[PDB]
């Protein structure tokens, strides 16, 4: 739940770093 939100945040983080 808040775990989804934290996982999401990491996925957004790394997505922003992708080639």
């Amino acid at each position, epitope marked *: 739940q808040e775990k989804n939100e934290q996982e999401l945040l990491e996925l957004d983080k790394w997505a922003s770093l992708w*080639n």
Partner: antibody
Amino acid sequence: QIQLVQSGPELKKPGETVKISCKASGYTFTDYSVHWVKQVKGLKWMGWINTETGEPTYADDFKGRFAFSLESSASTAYLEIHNLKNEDTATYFCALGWLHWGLGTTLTVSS
Amino acid sequence: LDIQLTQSPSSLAMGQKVTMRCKSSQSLLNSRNERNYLAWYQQKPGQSPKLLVYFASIRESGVPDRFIGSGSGTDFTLTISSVQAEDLADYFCLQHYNTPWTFGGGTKLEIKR
């Protein structure tokens, strides 16, 4: 768990060429862009290299004398500067995007 | 169309609370994921920049919680709740919304007397 190890201090003469390396670990190297930043007294963004295709992208003030390259199998990125100028004197950082900056490589160019 | 960042103040003097600001010439809000593409870094002489806060308001892991980023769109702030001696340093903002990436002019944290 991310580390970016950069090559040591450089002392060069005008006209020469220097090659700076950035060795990455703790992540999939070819998935994320490496950026290069110049710091003299503020910070200047030099451009980025696509770690997937190898394609470099240069900021306006960094077009002709600067080369971004890679050895992907070695998880290493390179900054090569040719025809060195006095004002190339600076600290150069590679960065894993905005997430994590290298320790920096100081370059001094002088006759 | 290079994005401009204006950072203020250029310096402030502290165990009280301090505030520094960054104003963007263009919105840094990504409509798609609703994140703001702005990070805050600390940097001490001879050393490299250290990420404090990313996506405008998310503290990086292990960063002391006395550090607080906030703001959205074109207006952003970094707050240090209670300044410690280890926090004396330069701080700057970075926009990574568009290339070329651009940086604030920095804020230096010194001791008041």
